[PDB]
Design a protein around this ligand. Sequence first.
Ligand SMILES: Nc1ncnc2c1ncn2[C@@H]1O[C@H](COP(=O)(O)OP(=O)(O)O)[C@@H](O)[C@H]1O
Ligand SMILES: [Mg+2]
Ligand SMILES: [Mg+2]
Length: 327
Amino acid sequence: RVREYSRAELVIGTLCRVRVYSKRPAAEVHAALEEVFTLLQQQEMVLSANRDDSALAALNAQAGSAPVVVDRSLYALLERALFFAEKSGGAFNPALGAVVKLWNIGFDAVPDPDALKEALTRCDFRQVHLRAGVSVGAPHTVQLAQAGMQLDLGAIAKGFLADKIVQLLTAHALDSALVDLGGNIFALGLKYGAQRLEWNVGIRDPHGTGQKPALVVSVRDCSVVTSGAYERFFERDGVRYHHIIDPVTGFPAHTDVDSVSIFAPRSTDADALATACFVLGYEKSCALLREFPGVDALFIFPDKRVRASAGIVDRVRVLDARFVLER
Ligand SMILES: Nc1ncnc2c1ncn2[C@@H]1O[C@H](COP(=O)(O)OP(=O)(O)O)[C@@H](O)[C@H]1O
Ligand SMILES: [Mg+2]
Ligand SMILES: [Mg+2]
């Protein structure tokens, strides 16, 4: 008997839901889901920026001092984040904490011009030194060379966690699932109905209440992560300030797309690239994405035109006829 299971909780500061189809005994699926959400709870205390408690916060507290020992997994995440910092030319920047914290208070007024200029001197991700010994049991260490520099993994954390969850589900012999971490999707395998079908993931209207999808894409074994100008913002004197920062200016990025969705085998990659591509804009995004052949992208423009890379365009269906899919 094929059974369908779902579970959701408020965790890592958002609503996380996993949906599973399985013929394994219910007890086994329940065990897997129990562990998925235990993982998420534990990982919140490792990765969460703005905590005091988290490993990340402790790491930030040691900026400008001695190397700090970290678990293999946090290390691996940092390696990847720096990787995308280099490839994207800093558009995605995991060492942007000093600036983000200044805007984080705004949500609760615009930062001061110089204060902002000052924070940016403390965002050189190239000053993040990762070192790992090669001998049996050698430790993994991180050193923030520049004083005042603060790590913030908010733009790659969900992807990292979705990949961890997929590993977990797979470890429990589950091969059909839809992982949703606050809009960060991973579609594992196929769902059940033509019997076995691709998952249908909706992309919201960037200006929409998010109750209905503008588009829907069919995918298997794939992450779908969207970066929008309206996922999170505050308004002051007629001006909207969204959460995604352009590290050159220190202000919310001004770009020629309303949203960019990345489709990748790894959600970690999809999450970082989605953020980078938003900051870069359409043309520079296309250039960067050519260096990642196994990745696909979907851009929604302010005039409601939609462009999709060759890998997914055939799998895209428009639900809101105000939008047009260019071929
Ligand atoms: N240019 C950037 N590079 C990396 N991280 C960023 C950047 N700008 C903002 N951030 C951090 O990442 C978060 C946004 O990441 P993103 O993945 O685009 O959105 P979401 O949080 O919805 O996944 C912000 O809340 C901020 O803390
Ligand atoms: Mg991101
Ligand atoms: Mg993200």
